[PDB]
């Protein structure tokens, strides 16, 4: 990554794919500790030992 601290601060960035473009949204899994994804991540579908592909995501407006 690479950016300056003279403008944008804590912009819309994913947790995994850490996207930059402003297209997706904040999608927080249903039942989980810390699982947030964006439109893309969702479209493709992500998961792991912790998060299960059978976990739905909710749309929130925080980031
Ligand atoms: Zn993402
Ligand atoms: Zn989950």
**Ligand 2 mean position, distance from CA 30 (Å):** 6
- Name the experimental technique: NMR
- Nearest-angstrom CA–CA distance, 59 and 63: 11
Residue 2 tokens, joined: 């690479």
Q: How far is CA 45 from CA 3, 9, 40, 48, in A?
A: 28, 28, 8, 11
Q: What is the number of the ligand closest to the CA of 16?
A: 1
**Domain extents for the chain?**
1-63
The answer on whether 17 is annotated among ligand-binding residues is yes
The single residue listed with the structure tokens 């994913």 is: 14
The Cα-based distances of 12 to 15, 17, 27, 28, 53 in angstroms read: 10, 12, 12, 14, 24
Phi-psi region of 18 (alpha: psi -120 to 50; beta: other; left: phi over 0): left
Q: What gap in Å lies between CA 8 and CA 3, rounded to an integer?
A: 9
CATH superfamily of 1-63: Zinc finger, ZZ-type (3.30.60.90)
In degrees, to the nearest 5, what angle opens at C-alpha 42 toward C-alphas 39 and 44? 115
Give residue numbers after which the chain breaks (C–N above 2.5 Å).
none
Phi-psi region of 10 (alpha: psi -120 to 50; beta: other; left: phi over 0): left
Ligand nearest to the CA of 63: 1
SS3 label, residue 59: strand
């Amino acid at each position: 990554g690479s950016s300056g601290s003279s403008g944008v601060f804590h912009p819309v960035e994913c947790s995994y794919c850490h996207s930059e473009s402003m297209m997706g949204f904040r999608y927080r899994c249903q039942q989980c500790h810390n699982y947030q994804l964006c439109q893309d991540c969702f479209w493709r579908g992500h998961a792991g030992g912790s998060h299960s592909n059978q976990h739905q995501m909710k749309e929130y407006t925080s980031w």
